[PDB]
C-alpha cells in the first residue's frame, strides 16, 4: 500500500556494475560505474574518462561475482567507452528508453558506485535537456538532472521509472568535488549509436555535413532579421559536401533534425556528430523567413580519433583509424621522436593482420593484444610492398 | 502512465526569467532569476540583492528572447524588487498561491539559473515554515526546503504542484556555496504585497503597530506564568501608537494575527511589516491567562528607505521618500560630505517635478531618470520657494 | 487534491525533539535530534556521540517547550544512547517499524535539528542497505539513504511514508562537512534491542557465538571452492562456545540469521552483537557445498563496555559492568594512575548500594548519581567483607 521505487529496481540493478581499473602513463588506480548493454556478449558500456589508459579493467556485478573485462572501443570526443566482460554468465542487460522523448518534468533514478561504497541509488527528476559547454571540443548534448551524483557514479545508469536507460552519468558541477544538485548524463540515443558502431569496428565512424556554424542567438538574430532566438546558424558550407549537394546555403538557420526540433548548434553537431556515414537524414531549414526541408546524405570526414596509444597502450605515435571495408588498421600521420615511428612505423601504413591472425579492422587487432603476446608481429603494407614490424 | 512534472512545468517554465545585470559601486557583473507577475506590463519580481546597484539589466526568457528591464522599485529590508521589461511582448505571467496555506509536508519544484546554465528545475518539499534570523535586521518569514538552489538561483520561482507560485528563493545555508540541503523563500503574500505597493508609488510605504517585543520563549513564559511556548511577547506599547489606542498593554502575548496563529515575534514583525499603512487588521491577545481580541489599524512610522542613491545611482546623501498623497518625492535627512548635499541638496525639500515633468511619487521621478537625459533640472520647494536644481 | 506528506508528519512531528547538550573533557556545546520512544517515562533515543561527556542535557520539543534530561544508557560501540525527560507531560512517541523488511526502492523523510535551526524535514529513498566500514570497530548495518542529513541531524528520525521510525540517523559521508546524498541511519530493528537493554539495565549485556571469521569475498569463495560471492566466513570457532556447542566447523559460510539472508560478516556481527545473552537464534549454514541449520543460544563474554568515566562523568578509571542477576556494579579491572583508583578503587569490587540505597545493577547507580550528592558513599564488597568509598 506504500508507493517504491524497489519493484523496479529489483529488475534493473544487475543490470549495473561496479568497475576498478589500474593504470599508468606513474602508477594508478580508478573505479566507477558501468552499465551491462548485452547479455550474451558481455558487453557494458561506461565513461571512457574512467577507463581510459588502463592496464588492468575489473568488473564486479551487484550480486558480488567480479569478472576480468577487456576494451572494445573507446569515445574521448563523447565520453563514451565499451569494454566487453572476459567469459559473461548469466548476466542481466538494460533495455534503452528514447532518450528523445524525456521532458524536463520527468522523474529520474541514479545508480552507481560513489566513493567504491557500494552499488547506490538516488533519485531525482530532469532538471534540463540538451545542457553543452562544459568541454567545448566535446559532442556534448547532456540530460540534466538532481539525483545525487558525485565521484564514482561515471559510467552508471540513469533510468526512468520503468527501469529503462535514458543515459549515462558523466559529470556535476561542483566546486570542492560534492554533489550539489546539478549533474549531467549523456542522452540514451547518443549511447545507442556510439556503441553499436563500436561493437562491429573498434571505433566510430564520424560522418559530416560539412557546415561552420554557430549558435543563434537573440542578437545575431536581429542582425539577421530571423524570428527564431534559438538553432543552428550557418556561417558557410563546405564545397563537394553533403551540404553544398543538398542546396544548404550560408545565412541559413537549421532549426530541425528528422522532425525534432533543434535546441542549439551544439546539439546538432552532438547528434550528427553520433551518427555513422552514410546515414540519411533530413534538415529543417530556415533561409530568408522561409521554411526549407532537405535531404541529406552524412559523408566521409577528417575525424581525430584512436591514437596509436589507445591500442598499443602507452606507445604514442602515429594516429590510426579502419579504412575503406573491413580492410585493415591505417596509420594517419606519425609524429617524430614518438614511440611508434622508433619501431618503424611510417604513415601511410596499412596493418593487415598480426601474429598470423588477419585484421579488418581495430577491433579484430585490439583481439590479438587482448591474447598479450610476448612478441607483436605487425603484417603492414607500404606501397606495394609487404613488411613486418615487430614489438615486445 | 508515468507520473511527471512535465505537464505542469510546461504552462509554468515561461514565466521565471533569467537576469544579468552590470553595474558599479569598481565594475561587476551579477546574475539570477526573476518571475513574471503581471505579462502585459512586463513586471517581474526578483531578489533586491540581485539588482541592486546595477546600472544595465538584461532579461532573458526560457525561449531565448532578451529584453532591457529598468527599474520600478525595491525593499533592501525585504529583499524584494520590481523591475519592469521595457517593450513587453506576448508574455506568460505566474498565478500566485495562498502561501498561509502552505504545510511542511508539501511537496515544491524550484525553477531558476543556477550558475547561468539556463533554466533549471529542481525539486524537494516544505522543510520548514517561519524560518528567520538569516539577517535579523530584516523581515523575513523564510519557507525552508530542500530543492536545490545555487547561486544564480535568487529571485526565481518556487512553485507547488499546481504550478502556483509559493515564494521567491533567495538564501541558502550552505559552508562552501554549494548546496547542502537547505534553502530559503520569501513566503509569496509577502511578494504580493509588497510588489503591488511598489507598482502603485515606487516604495513600500511601512505601517506601525508602535510596539516593543521579543521572542516568547519557554523560559521567559514561566517567568510570566503564560500557557505558550511560542509568540510576540509585548515588552512595551508606544504613546499615541495604534497598539496604545487598541488597548494592548505591555506583557501581553500576541499569538493570532487575524485569524491566523503566530509563529514568534519575527514572523509578526515580517507580516505587518508588509502590510501598506491604514490596513485594518485583527490581534489574538493572551493577557493574565485570558484570551482577548483587539482591532487595529496600521500607523505612520519612521521606517528608513529609499536613499538618494537608490533613485540617483551613485549620488549618495539625504534619504528620501514619497510624501502625503501623490504630493511628490521629500528628502528625508542629507549627510554633509555626501555628493548629494554637493549639487544643494537640502532636507526638507519637496521635488515636485523633473524635466518639466510632473513628480507625484518615487516612481514617475524614476521614471523620468529611465530616460537618461543629460541635465536633470529638480524642480523642489524650499519653504514656500520653488527653486530648481540641475544636476549632469 | 494534491499529494503531501503533511498529514502524515503533522502526527509525527512531535515525536522527534532537539537536544542541548553541555560538557568538559575545556568546556563544550553541542546539539543534535532525538526520539521519542516511550511517552510516558520520557524515554528519548539518540546517538551516543551527541550527548557523550555530556554534564547537562536539555530536551526541546517541536511546541517549544523545553525539559531537562538525564542519561539513562549509552553503546559506544553501536553509537546508541538512551536519555530520559525529567517530569514527561503530554508526549507523543514514534511507533517503530520493523527495519528488516526495508527495500532500496523505499520512499524515506528524515526529521531533526540541522545546525539548531529548528525542526527540518528531508526526503529521499533508501539507497541502499547494510553499509559498514564508517568505523570498523563498531557494529553497523546502515540504512544508506539519499534524504538531506546534516550536523544536528544526528539521533534523528528517519521514516517511512507512514510516518514508522525505520531508522536514527547518524553519520554523512561529506567533504566539507556538508551533505552530498549520502548519509547513514542504524535500523530501527538495533535499536529496538539495545534501548530496550538499557531500560532495564543501564547497559547492554552482550552475547556472542564465538567464532572468528571475515568477509566471504569472491576471490576468497574459489580458493574455497564455494557457491555464493557473500556471507560470513568461518575461519574458526571458540573451544566450549555456543558455535562449538552448535557443530559449527572452522571453513563453514553463514548466509542466514533466523530466515534472513546474510549480507556479509559485518551485518552478521551487527545483528548478533544486538542480541540480548541467552537470546535462541538459528543459523543458515553452508559446509562443502550442502546447506545446514543450526540452533544456537547466545552466550556471555567479555565485551568491553561502561568505563567508570561513563557513570562518574569524569573519574577515569577501571571499567564496570552489571553482574549476573541484579547483584550490583562489578568493577571489572582497573588502571594505575587513573583517578577512581585513586579513591580506594580495585577491581574485583562489588558496588552493593550507594547513600543508604540499593544497587542492582548501572541504572540504579546513576540514578542515585542523578540527584547529584554532595559526598557520595559507596558500599562495596572486597572479598568477604563490606567496606565503603567516598567521593565529592
Redesign the interface.
Known amino acids: 500500500q506504500?508507493?517504491?521505487?524497489?519493484?523496479?529496481?529489483?529488475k534493473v540493478?544487475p543490470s549495473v556494475v561496479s568497475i576498478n581499473v589500474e593504470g599508468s602513463t606513474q602508477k594508478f588506480m580508478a573505479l566507477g560505474s558501468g552499465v551491462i548493454i548485452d547479455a550474451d556478449k558481455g558487453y557494458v558500456v561506461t565513461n571512457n574518462h574512467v577507463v581510459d589508459n588502463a592496464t588492468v579493467i575489473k568488473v564486479?556485478l551487484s550480486?558480488?561475482?567480479?569478472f576480468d573485462a577487456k576494451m572494445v572501443g573507446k569515445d574521448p570526443r563523447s565520453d563514451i567507452a565499451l569494454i566487453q566482460i572476459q567469459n559473461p554468465k548469466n548476466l542481466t542487460a538494460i533495455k534503452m528508453a528514447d532518450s528523445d522523448a524525456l521532458?524536463?518534468?520527468?522523474?529520474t533514478v541514479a545508480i552507481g558506485n560513489?566513493?567504491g561504497?557500494?552499488?547506490?541509488?538516488?533519485?531525482?527528476?530532469?532538471?534540463?535537456l540538451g545542457?553543452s559547454g562544459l568541454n567545448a571540443e566535446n559532442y556534448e548534448n547532456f540530460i540534466?538532472t538532481?539525483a545525487?551524483?558525485?565521484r564514482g557514479n561515471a559510467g552508471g545508469a540513469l533510468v526512468?521509472?520503468?527501469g529503462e536507460l535514458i543515459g549515462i552519468n558523466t559529470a556535476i558541477?561542483?566546486?570542492?568535488?560534492?554533489?550539489?544538485?546539478?549533474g549531467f548524463a549523456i542522452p540514451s540515443n547518443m549511447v545507442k549509436n556510439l556503441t553499436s558502431q563500436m561493437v562491429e569496428y573498434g571505433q566510430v565512424k564520424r560522418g559530416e555535413l560539412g557546415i561552420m556554424g554557430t549558435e543563434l542567438?537573440?542578437?545575431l538574430a536581429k542582425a539577421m532579421k530571423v524570428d527564431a532566438?534559438?538553432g543552428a546558424f550557418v556561417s558557410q558550407v563546405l564545397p563537394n559536401s553533403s551540404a553544398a549537394k543538398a542546396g544548404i546555403k550560408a545565412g541559413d538557420v537549421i532549426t530541425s533534425l528528422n522532425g525534432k526540433p533543434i535546441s542549439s548548434f551544439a546539439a546538432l553537431r552532438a547528434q550528427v556528430g553520433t551518427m555513422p556515414v552514410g546515414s540519411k537524414l533530413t534538415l529543417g531549414l530556415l533561409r530568408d523567413g522561409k521554411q526549407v526541408n532537405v535531404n541529406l546524405e552524412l559523408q566521409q570526414s577528417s575525424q581525430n580519433q584512436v591514437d596509436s596509444s589507445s591500442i598499443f597502450n602507452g606507445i604514442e605515435g602515429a594516429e590510426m583509424s579502419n579504412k575503406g571495408k573491413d580492410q585493415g588498421v591505417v596509420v594517419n600521420n606519425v609524429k617524430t621522436g614518438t614511440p611508434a615511428a622508433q619501431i618503424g612505423l611510417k604513415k601511410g601504413d596499412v596493418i593487415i593482420g598480426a601474429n598470423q591472425q588477419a585484421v579488418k579492422n581495430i577491433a579484430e587487432l585490439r583481439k590479438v593484444l587482448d591474447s598479450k603476446p610476448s612478441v607483436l608481429a605487425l603484417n603492414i603494407q607500404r606501397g606495394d610492398s609487404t613488411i613486418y614490424l615487430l614489438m615486445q
Open positions: 506504500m508507493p517504491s521505487l524497489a519493484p523496479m529496481l529489483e540493478m564486479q550480486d558480488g561475482r567480479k521532458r524536463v518534468g520527468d522523474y560513489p566513493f561504497l557500494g552499488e547506490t541509488v538516488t533519485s531525482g527528476i530532469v532538471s534540463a545542457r540534466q538532481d545525487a551524483i558525485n526512468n521509472l520503468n558541477l561542483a566546486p570542492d568535488g560534492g554533489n550539489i544538485g546539478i542567438n537573440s542578437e532566438q534559438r
